[PDB]
Amino acid sequence: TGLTDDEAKEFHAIFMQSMYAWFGLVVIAHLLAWLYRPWL
Amino acid sequence: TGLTDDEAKEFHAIFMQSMYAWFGLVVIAHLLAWLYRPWL
Amino acid sequence: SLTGLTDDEAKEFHAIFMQSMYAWFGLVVIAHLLAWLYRPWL
Amino acid sequence: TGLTDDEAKEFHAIFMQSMYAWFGLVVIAHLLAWLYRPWL
Amino acid sequence: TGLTDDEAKEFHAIFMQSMYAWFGLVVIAHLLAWLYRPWL
Amino acid sequence: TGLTDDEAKEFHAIFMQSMYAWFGLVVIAHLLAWLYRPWL
Amino acid sequence: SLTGLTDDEAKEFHAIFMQSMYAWFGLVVIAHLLAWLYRPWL
Amino acid sequence: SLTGLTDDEAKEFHAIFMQSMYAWFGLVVIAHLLAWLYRPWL
Amino acid sequence: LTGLTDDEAKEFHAIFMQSMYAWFGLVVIAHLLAWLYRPWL
Amino acid sequence: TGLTDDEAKEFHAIFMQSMYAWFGLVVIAHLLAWLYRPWL
Amino acid sequence: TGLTDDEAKEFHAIFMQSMYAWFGLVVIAHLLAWLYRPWL
Amino acid sequence: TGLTDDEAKEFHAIFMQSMYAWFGLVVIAHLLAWLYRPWL
Amino acid sequence: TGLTDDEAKEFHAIFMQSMYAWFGLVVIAHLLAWLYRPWL
Amino acid sequence: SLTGLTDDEAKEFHAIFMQSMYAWFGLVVIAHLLAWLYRPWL
Amino acid sequence: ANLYKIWLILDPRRVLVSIVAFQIVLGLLIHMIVLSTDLNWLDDNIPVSYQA
Amino acid sequence: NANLYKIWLILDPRRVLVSIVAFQIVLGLLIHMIVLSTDLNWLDDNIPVSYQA
Amino acid sequence: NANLYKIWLILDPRRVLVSIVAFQIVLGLLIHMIVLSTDLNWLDDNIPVSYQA
Amino acid sequence: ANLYKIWLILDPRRVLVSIVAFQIVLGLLIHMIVLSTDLNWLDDNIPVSYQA
Amino acid sequence: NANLYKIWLILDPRRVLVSIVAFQIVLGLLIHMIVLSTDLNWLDDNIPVSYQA
Amino acid sequence: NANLYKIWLILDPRRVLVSIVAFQIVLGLLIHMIVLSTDLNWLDDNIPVSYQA
Amino acid sequence: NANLYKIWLILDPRRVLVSIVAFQIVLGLLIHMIVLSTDLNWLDDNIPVSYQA
Amino acid sequence: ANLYKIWLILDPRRVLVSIVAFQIVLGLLIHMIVLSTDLNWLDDNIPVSYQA
Amino acid sequence: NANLYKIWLILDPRRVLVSIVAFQIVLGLLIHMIVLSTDLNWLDDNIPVSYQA
Amino acid sequence: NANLYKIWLILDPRRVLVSIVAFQIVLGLLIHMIVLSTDLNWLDDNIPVSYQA
Amino acid sequence: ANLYKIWLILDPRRVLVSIVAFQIVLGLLIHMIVLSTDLNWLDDNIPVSYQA
Amino acid sequence: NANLYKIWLILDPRRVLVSIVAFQIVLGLLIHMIVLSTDLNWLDDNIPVSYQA
Amino acid sequence: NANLYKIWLILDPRRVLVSIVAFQIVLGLLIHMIVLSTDLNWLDDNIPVSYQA
Amino acid sequence: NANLYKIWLILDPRRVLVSIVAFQIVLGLLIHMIVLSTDLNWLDDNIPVSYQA
Ligand code: BCL
Ligand code: BCL
Ligand code: BCL
Ligand code: BCL
Ligand code: BCL
Ligand code: BCL
Ligand code: BCL
Ligand code: BCL
Ligand code: BCL
Ligand SMILES: COC(C)(C)C/C=C/C(C)=C/C=C/C(C)=C/C=C/C(C)=C/C=C/C=C(C)/C=C/C=C(C)/C=C/C=C(C)/C=C/CC(C)(C)OC
Ligand SMILES: [Ca+2]
Ligand SMILES: [Ca+2]
């Protein structure tokens, strides 16, 4: 890919932060959907 | 992409401003639609 | 830049584009007002 | 397009005049059609 | 197109004359068709 | 097209006389067909 | 000329073409006369 | 000559072609005579 | 045109005629037998 | 084909011999089939 | 592939660790599904 | 094909021997099949 | 393929060991499936 | 040779091929014996 | 008054070919459209019915 | 117009004649198709007499 | 704005005119068909008199 | 009287090939068209029916 | 922001205008077709007077 | 005319012969098929005697 | 993170905006078609009154 | 008497190949055509029906 | 392991992000359509009231 | 004639043999299917004894 | 113990891409298979029916 | 003839063997399928006993 | 034989492993689909209890 | 003969092995398809017991 090592570290940090934020949003949305219309 | 760092900063600022304005417009439109025809 | 336009040309094009888009929106608004006065849908 | 400024101005003048004549003809035709079969 | 100005004038004159003759023929034919089978 | 002016004149003369002969034959044929089976 | 033929060749070809076309039309006319004598259609 | 044949070759070919075509037409005529003798159609 | 000389044409024509005549004789015999078996006309 | 004359003679001899053997086998097989199921 | 030997060792170690974590997650999910809706 | 004469002769010998063995196997198999289910 | 002889020996050893492990796993799984739902 | 193999390589490959084919046929025969002992078809 | 310059933009030959083709197609289309309505002139038994 | 003979300095005569011939033949066929399917048919109208009887 | 005449320094006039002509012809045909499909038909509406009778 | 110059524009060979092909196709087409009307000469039981 | 006029240093104006025109025309046609099929139809609703009767 | 033999200076004899042979064979097949479907059939008309029965 | 502005050193802005615009337009059309087919329809629901009667 | 020159125009090899192919196709076609009429020799129960 | 950040020395970040975005959008659409077909539908279920009446 | 052995100076022997073999195999298969289809079938005619029963 | 040499034959990145794609496709397929049996969790009126 | 071994100076042995093997395998499959559909079937004939029942 | 390890001097190991993996996965899927259609199905057989009730 | 080992100087061993393995796998699948559809089926024959009772 041509990326160096420090660039890999920075990209990994930002990628993990964004993925965790996205997962938190999904979890909140599913909590609301369960509070509205339980399915299980 | 060939963009420098200051160009990236300026583009990010304008992109964030435009996305927030678009989201505000969508929120207002959905508020009006809920006031007219509630779906949930 | 990428398109090759300068900065003054960009300013002039933005001004004319904004004016034309606003005129188009005004015409659409008038037409929708007339259509609502004829056949209300909501 | 390769056009100069005077050529563009002349073309704009002629284009505007022709489009206005076409619109006048269309308006007269719809006036006659409304006088024959009112649709609204 | 490569045409000069005098050639353009001559072509315009002949084109307009031919178009007017064609339109005259069309209107005569439509007058006959109206005198035979009125439609409006 | 590469044609000269005298060649254009000669071709126009022959084309016109041939077209007129063809139209005369068509007119005679239509006269016979009307004398046999009137349609209008 | 575009086709490459000379003038005398064109004249000779035109003469032979006319002769053959007239013979073909004569045969067609005779055949149609016989067909009319057999089964009139008009 | 587009086809590359000399005048004498054209004459000889025309003679042989005419003879063969006449023979073929004679055979066809005999066959149609026999067919009419067997199963008249007109 | 095809490359054949003037004598090769004669030889080929002789052999072609002989073979075609033999084939036609066989066909005629076969049709004779078929007519003695199943008369169609 | 590039074949010589002696090669043509040899090939003709072998071809004729093989074709005659094949025809003899076919004739025997058809005799047996007729002795089993006459069709004519 | 062009990889050296130490790189192969490191990649194998990380691959095994990730595969084992994925299998543990799958096993836990299947345990929960079995306590919810037994199929066998 | 490029084969010499001795190679052709050896190939013919082996080909005939193998084809005869294959035909013997086929004959035995059809003998057994006839002893099981007579079709003719 | 370009492989040497020692590489062939090593690959054969590892391939055989892995194939035997896979077959043992398949045999255990089929034993469990037979203990659940006998098919023969 | 067309394939490029020498004579000794051909002999070795033939020996191994025959051994493997015979083992495969023995396994097939045993499997068919078991299948006949379960569900006779003939 | 300066409309004659329209031939310095549009090639005359293609203009004439397109005009001829479009007019022929339009004539065919309009004749077929009119034929299918009650303005038909062929199958309307005027002056006399010929099949009967 | 008197200067109408210059139309052959724009249009190639050969293509013009070929197109005219082809279009006229196609138009003749099409008009015969159209006329045959109306009550103006001249073949299947039992005039002078009916031959399939 | 008053500098709207510069739109021809961006768009090629020839293609603009060809596109305008083609679009207008297609729109005219489409609108005539749409109006024909409805009850505003002028051909098959027995006015001023029925002819197939 | 100068019509013989028509062969200085049209190629004589293609003209002849086109005439031959068109005439053959037209002959086939007209024979098929006539065969399907009441002018048929084959299936009209004249002078006598053969199948019966 | 106030520096939005730089959007034309990334997007080519000509293709932007062509896409806008084409999309607007297609949208107008599609919305008219959609509205025609509902009960808001203005053609086939016998107002003011039915013409085929 | 008497100079018709020049027709082979325009048309290639080989193609003429091939086309003639192919056209004659195709025409023979077509005419033998057309007649078979009419009442002039010679195969399936029970003459001199029916064989299936 | 606070260094997210480097996302434009990987992704080309022009294609990003083109894709965003196209996707949003398609999504708007799709959601409108989905909503129309349900009982939340605003056109063919006889409110305020019925115009075809 | 000069008909032997036809092989100076037509190539013998293609002539023989075309003759052989056409004759084989014609033989197949005529046997199929005859099979479907009342002259069939297979399914005509002569000299005796075998599936009975 | 703690040296997982080397995964970007094997996989190109740009294509990874593009694939993630496209797959997530497609998955969202597919799951919404799948849920709509079951009895968990929220549009055509007459809650709170019925509007087509 | 007695000089027929020259037929191999025109026809290539290899293709002749390949064509003969292929044509004979195809003909054998076709004649076998044709004979099976007719009344001379030898398999499904219950001779000598009826299996499947 | 020398299994780690498997990466000297197989390209790591293609292996990872194939694994990810295959696992996603398998997950979708297995969820489709389960959804069509009596183990369905959506349209089974538990805990309560909502379309009523 | 005794000089038949020269047939390998015309036909290439390798292609001959490949064609023979392929043709024999295809013929074996075809003949087994043909025999399976007649009353000589050995699988579904309830001999020596029915297994489904 | 004991010299079977030379089999990798003819067959390329990489393609062998790829083909083995692909064939095993396809066979697993095929056998699962085949078994699911018989009376050995484990999903839709109401064991231990029925959940759609 | 005893010199059969020369068959590998004509046929390439690698393609021979690939063809053998592919043909054997295809044959195994085909024979299982054929056998499963007859009355020798082992899956759906209610032996030892019926599981979907
Ligand atoms: C009541 C009707 C009679 C009958 C009436 C007649 C009559 C009448 C005739 C025949 C004739 C024939 N009949 Mg019979 N025939 C009957 C029933 C049959 C049956 C059957 C199973 O019922 C068969 C198999 C035949 C077969 C034959 C052939 C021997 C012969 C046609 C051969 C041919 O066309 O020449 C083909 C000509 C060639 C020159 C071919 C040359 C061969 C070449 C070398 C082959 C090379 C292959 C080539 C290049 C093609 C390549 C193919 C591709 C590679 C795939 N008949 C019934 C019993 N039959 C005809 C005949 O006997 O002719 C002598 C004939 O006139
Ligand atoms: C009740 C309805 C009437 C009828 C009502 C009308 C009306 C109204 C019109 C026609 C016109 C035409 N009709 Mg009308 N027409 C009827 C039935 C027919 C029938 C038929 C078999 O029933 C045919 C074959 C025609 C054919 C024609 C053409 C002569 C002409 C359209 C040509 C064109 O498209 O120009 C396009 C071609 C070009 C632009 C090429 C250039 C012109 C060339 C060089 C010159 C050729 C002659 C030209 C077409 C002039 C035609 C006049 C003729 C001498 C009569 N009509 C019935 C009887 N018809 C139109 C017309 O007359 O135009 C003057 C017209 O307006
Ligand atoms: C009850 C409904 C009326 C009717 C209502 C209307 C109304 C309303 C209109 C028309 C218009 C038109 N109608 Mg109308 N029309 C009716 C039935 C017909 C019938 C028919 C056989 O029934 C035909 C053939 C036509 C044909 C026409 C065209 C002359 C014109 C559309 C051309 C165009 O799209 O220009 C597009 C082409 C271009 C832009 C190319 C550039 C210009 C070219 C070089 C010249 C074009 C010729 C020009 C249009 C001729 C107009 C002169 C007269 C107005 C006739 N109408 C019925 C009787 N019709 C339109 C019109 O008149 O426009 C002025 C219009 O607004
Ligand atoms: C009730 C209607 C009549 C009938 C009425 C007519 C009428 C009327 C005509 C024909 C003509 C023809 N008919 Mg007739 N015809 C009928 C039944 C048939 C049957 C059949 C099996 O029933 C056949 C095969 C034919 C065949 C023929 C052709 C000989 C000819 C068309 C050839 C052509 O298109 O030349 C086109 C080919 C070329 C131009 C190529 C150049 C010339 C070549 C080199 C030679 C051609 C041979 C020449 C046409 C033969 C004519 C000699 C005699 C008239 C037979 N008719 C029925 C019985 N027929 C036409 C004709 O006789 O033309 C002279 C014609 O006008
Ligand atoms: C009850 C429903 C009403 C109706 C309700 C509305 C409403 C609401 C609107 C329209 C609009 C339009 N209607 Mg309406 N409309 C009705 C029925 C029709 C019928 C018909 C045959 O029944 C036609 C042909 C039209 C045609 C039109 C167009 C003039 C316009 C859409 C053009 C466009 O998409 O611009 C897109 C093209 C571009 C962006 C290209 C750039 C500009 C170009 C150079 C010029 C465009 C032409 C311009 C729109 C002309 C304006 C004319 C006047 C508004 C009359 N309507 C009925 C009677 N209609 C829209 C409109 O008026 O826009 C101003 C609109 O908002
Ligand atoms: C009641 C109807 C009659 C019948 C009425 C006619 C009539 C009428 C004619 C034929 C003619 C032919 N018929 Mg017949 N025909 C009948 C039924 C058949 C049957 C069948 C299975 O029933 C067959 C196979 C044929 C076959 C034939 C061909 C021999 C010939 C057409 C060949 C051709 O197109 O030449 C085109 C081929 C070439 C130009 C290539 C060159 C010719 C080569 C070099 C020579 C080959 C032999 C040649 C065809 C001449 C045949 C000799 C004898 C006349 C048989 N007829 C029935 C019994 N038939 C035509 C004919 O006899 O022409 C002479 C013809 O006019
Ligand atoms: C009873 C069922 C509920 C419902 C249950 C759920 C559940 C559970 C979830 C959603 C989620 C979503 N729902 Mg919902 N949803 C319902 C009805 C709707 C309606 C409608 C017209 O009925 C629409 C248009 C939507 C649309 C949405 C999206 C906002 C979102 C899926 C986006 C995505 O796939 O990101 C994929 C795109 C990317 C990964 C690209 C990268 C991110 C980009 C740059 C921005 C994406 C926009 C972001 C998701 C907006 C979130 C803001 C708020 C959470 C709304 N839902 C009904 C009312 N919905 C999901 C969600 O909220 O995620 C946070 C989710 O988990
Ligand atoms: C009532 C009908 C009988 C039956 C009657 C016959 C008859 C009769 C024959 C066969 C033959 C065969 N049968 Mg059986 N057969 C029956 C049912 C079956 C069933 C089944 C599942 O029901 C199968 C799988 C077979 C399979 C076979 C093959 C072993 C063989 C065809 C192979 C081939 O085409 O070689 C072609 C392949 C090549 C030429 C490639 C070259 C040689 C290769 C390297 C080795 C091939 C293996 C060889 C065939 C092994 C044969 C040894 C034994 C005879 C088994 N039979 C039933 C029980 N079967 C044929 C045979 O035995 O041939 C010897 C044969 O003649
Ligand atoms: C009533 C019918 C019987 C049955 C009767 C038979 C008979 C008879 C035979 C088989 C054979 C096979 N059966 Mg079984 N079989 C039944 C039902 C099944 C079911 C199932 C889900 O119902 C499956 C998956 C199988 C699968 C198998 C394979 C193991 C084998 C075919 C492999 C092949 O094509 O060789 C091709 C293989 C290769 C090309 C790979 C080369 C060798 C490799 C390296 C070694 C791998 C193992 C190999 C497949 C050997 C298999 C032996 C196993 C240890 C059991 N059977 C039922 C129970 N089956 C055949 C067999 O056992 O062959 C020995 C065989 O003769
Ligand atoms: C270069 O190398 C160096 C030097 C670096 C050394 C390194 C070497 C290394 C690291 C090597 C690693 C090797 C590995 C990991 C190998 C793994 C191999 C495996 C797992 C092999 C598995 C093989 C399994 C086989 C071949 C199974 C075959 C089964 C068959 C053919 C079954 C067929 C069944 C059928 C057709 C059934 C049909 C019946 C049904 C019912 C389906 O019909 C409807
Ligand atoms: Ca008549
Ligand atoms: Ca018989």
| Cβ <8 Å between V7 and I9 | yes
Please name which of AA43, Y34, K30, AA41 lies closest in space to residue M37, comparing C-alpha atoms: AA41
Give me the residue from T5, T13, T40 closest to H11, CB to CB: T5
Please name which of X51, Q40, J7 lies closest in space to residue S51, comparing C-alpha atoms: Q40
CA distance V39 to V37: 5
Asked whether P and R share 3 or more beta-carbon pairs under 8 angstroms, the answer is yes
CA distance G39 to AB19: 73
CA distance P39 to F37: 11
Any binding-site annotation on AB8? no
Q: Looking at ligand 3, which atom is closest to the CA of residue Q27?
A: 34
Amino acid in the structure at residue N34: L
CA atoms within 13 A of residue C41's CA, in its CB half-sphere? 15
Cα-flanking dihedrals φ and ψ of residue Z44, to 5°? -100, 70
Burial class (CB in 10 A: 0-12, 13-18, 19+), H5: middle
Tell me, what DSSP letter sits at residue S17? H
CATH number of the domain within which R33 lies: 4.10.220.20
Largest CA distance in chain P: 64
Number of domains in chain U: 1
Residue A25 in contact with ligand 7 by CB distance below 6 A: yes
| Cβ <8 Å between U51 and S35 | no
Coil, strand, or helix at residue N3? Answer: coil
Residue L8 in contact with ligand 8 by CB distance below 6 A: no
End-to-end CA separation in angstroms for chain T: 62
Asked whether I and P share 3 or more beta-carbon pairs under 8 angstroms, the answer is no
Radius of gyration of chain S (CA): 20
Coil, strand, or helix at residue K36? Answer: helix
CA atoms within 13 A of residue U23's CA, in its CB half-sphere? 11
CA distance I30 to L12: 40
Contact U4, B12 (CB under 8 A): yes
Contact B11, U8 (CB under 8 A): yes
Residue whose structure tokens are 């005509």: V44
Tell me, what DSSP letter sits at residue AB11? S
The residues near AB38 (Cβ < 8 Å, ≥ 6 apart) are Z43, Z44
From Q11's Cα to the closest Cα of chain D, the distance in A is: 7
The residues near K12 (Cβ < 8 Å, ≥ 6 apart) are Y3, Y4, Y6, Y7
| Ligand in closest contact with the CA of N33 | 9
- ω before V47 within 30° of 0 (cis)? yes
Domains within chain H, CATH numbers bracketed: 3-42 (1.20.5.250)
User: Is V50 touching I (CB cutoff 8 A)?
Assistant: no
Cα-flanking dihedrals φ and ψ of residue U27, to 5°? -65, -40
Instruction: Give the pair of three-digit tokens for residue Q48.
Output: 């001023």
Q: What angle do CA L13, L14, L16 make, to 5 degrees?
A: 70
Residues belonging to chain V: 52
Tell me, what DSSP letter sits at residue AA37? T
CA distance J40 to J6: 46
Residue whose structure tokens are 């084909």: J1
**C&Q contacts, CB < 8 Å:** 6
**B&W contacts, CB < 8 Å:** 6
The residues near Z9 (Cβ < 8 Å, ≥ 6 apart) are L1, L3, L5, L8
Residue whose structure tokens are 């003639």: T20
Please name which of AA46, P17, X33 lies closest in space to residue G2, comparing C-alpha atoms: P17
How many angstroms separate the Cα of J23 from the Cα of each of J16, J17, J19, J27, U45? 11, 10, 6, 6, 87
Any binding-site annotation on G27? no
CA distance S17 to AB32: 64
Asked whether A and U share 3 or more beta-carbon pairs under 8 angstroms, the answer is yes
| Ligand in closest contact with the CA of D30 | 3
Contact A15, U1 (CB under 8 A): no
Instruction: Give the pair of three-digit tokens for residue K36.
Output: 């919810």
Any binding-site annotation on G42? yes
Transcribe G21-38 into DSSP letters: HHHHHHHHHHHHHHHHHH
CB atoms within 10 A of CB G24: 12
CA distance O42 to O39: 9
User: Is H21 touching V (CB cutoff 8 A)?
Assistant: no
CB interface of T with G, residues 3-22, below 8 Å = 3-4
3-state secondary structure V6-43: HHHCCCHHHHHHHHHHHHHHHHHHHHHHHHCCCCCCCC
Contact J7, X4 (CB under 8 A): no
Contacts 24+ apart (CB under 8 A), H38-42: H38/I41, H39/R50, H39/T40, H39/T42, H40/R47, H41/R41, H41/R42, H41/T40, H42/G38, H42/R41, H42/R46, H42/R47
The residues near AB21 (Cβ < 8 Å, ≥ 6 apart) are none
**A&U contacts, CB < 8 Å:** 6
CB atoms within 10 A of CB T8: 21
Q: Looking at ligand 1, which atom is closest to the CA of residue X31?
A: 21
Q: Which residues of chain T does R49 touch, with a Cβ-Cβ cutoff of 8 Å?
A: 39
Residue whose structure tokens are 């990872």: Y16
Please name which of O15, Q5, O18 lies closest in space to residue D15, comparing C-alpha atoms: Q5
Instruction: Give the pair of three-digit tokens for residue Z36.
Output: 């399976």
Transcribe Z16-51 into DSSP letters: HHHHHHHHHHHHHHHHHHHHHTSTT-SSSS--S--S
Amino acid in the structure at residue H8: D
User: Is U53 touching B (CB cutoff 8 A)?
Assistant: no
Radius of gyration of chain U (CA): 20
Q: Which residues of chain Z does X50 touch, with a Cβ-Cβ cutoff of 8 Å?
A: 39
Q: Which residues of chain G does T3 touch, with a Cβ-Cβ cutoff of 8 Å?
A: 12, 16
Give Cα I7 to chain centroid, integer Å.
22
| Cβ <8 Å between G2 and P14 | yes
| Cβ <8 Å between Z51 and AB35 | no
Contact S36, S43 (CB under 8 A): yes
What distance in angstroms lies between residue A30's CA and the mean position of ligand 7's atoms?
10
Residue whose structure tokens are 């002789």: I14
From X45's Cα to the closest Cα of chain V, the distance in A is: 5
CA distance X51 to W11: 67
Instruction: Give the pair of three-digit tokens for residue Q35.
Output: 């109006």
The residues near AA41 (Cβ < 8 Å, ≥ 6 apart) are AA35, AB51, AB52
From T28's Cα to the closest Cα of chain H, the distance in A is: 11
CA distance AB35 to Q31: 65
Please name which of Z38, I1, E13 lies closest in space to residue T17, comparing C-alpha atoms: I1
Where b means 16+ CB within 10 Å and e means fewer, M9-39 reads: ebbbeebeeeeeeeeeeeeeeeeeeeeeeee
Any binding-site annotation on O7? no
CB atoms within 10 A of CB AA22: 11
Contact P3, O5 (CB under 8 A): no
CA distance G28 to S24: 63
Instruction: Give the pair of three-digit tokens for residue K15.
Output: 């691959």
Q: Which domain covers residue O13, as residue numbers? A: 1-52
Amino acid in the structure at residue J35: L
Q: Which residues of chain U does S41 touch, with a Cβ-Cβ cutoff of 8 Å?
A: 51-52
CA distance I41 to T43: 8
What distance in angstroms lies between residue T18's CA and the mean position of ligand 1's atoms?
26
Radius of gyration of chain G (CA): 17
Q: Which residues of chain M does Y3 touch, with a Cβ-Cβ cutoff of 8 Å?
A: 14
Instruction: Give the pair of three-digit tokens for residue U2.
Output: 């606070």
CA distance Q24 to Q27: 5
Instruction: Give the pair of three-digit tokens for residue E21.
Output: 């003759």
| Cβ <8 Å between W3 and K17 | no
Burial class (CB in 10 A: 0-12, 13-18, 19+), V10: middle
From G22's Cα to the closest Cα of chain T, the distance in A is: 12
Contact R49, T39 (CB under 8 A): yes
3-state secondary structure U1-53: CCCHHHHHHCCCHHHHHHHHHHHHHHHHHHHHHHHHCCCCCCCCCCCCCCCCC
Cα-flanking dihedrals φ and ψ of residue L28, to 5°? -65, -40
Instruction: Give the pair of three-digit tokens for residue B13.
Output: 């600022």
User: Is H9 touching V (CB cutoff 8 A)?
Assistant: no
Residue whose structure tokens are 């030898």: X42
| Ligand in closest contact with the CA of V30 | 6
| Cβ <8 Å between Q8 and D11 | yes
Report which protein residue has its CA nearest ligand 2's atom 2. Answer: E33
Amino acid in the structure at residue U50: S
CA distance N23 to L39: 36
Largest CA distance in chain C: 50
Please name which of G13, R13, R6 lies closest in space to residue T1, comparing C-alpha atoms: G13
CA distance S28 to T12: 62
The residues near U39 (Cβ < 8 Å, ≥ 6 apart) are W43, W44, W46, W50, W51, W52
Q: In terms of CA atoms, which chain B residue is nearest residue W52?
A: B37
Contact E40, S51 (CB under 8 A): no
The residues near O47 (Cβ < 8 Å, ≥ 6 apart) are F38
| Cβ <8 Å between E12 and O41 | no
Q: What angle do CA T39, T44, T50 make, to 5 degrees?
A: 130
The residues near X12 (Cβ < 8 Å, ≥ 6 apart) are J1
CA distance M1 to AB14: 11
What distance in angstroms lies between residue V21's CA and the mean position of ligand 12's atoms?
29
Instruction: Give the pair of three-digit tokens for residue AA19.
Output: 């083909």
Contact Z38, X43 (CB under 8 A): yes
Coil, strand, or helix at residue R49? Answer: coil
Q: What is the resolution of this structure in A?
A: 3.3
Tell me, what DSSP letter sits at residue K16? H
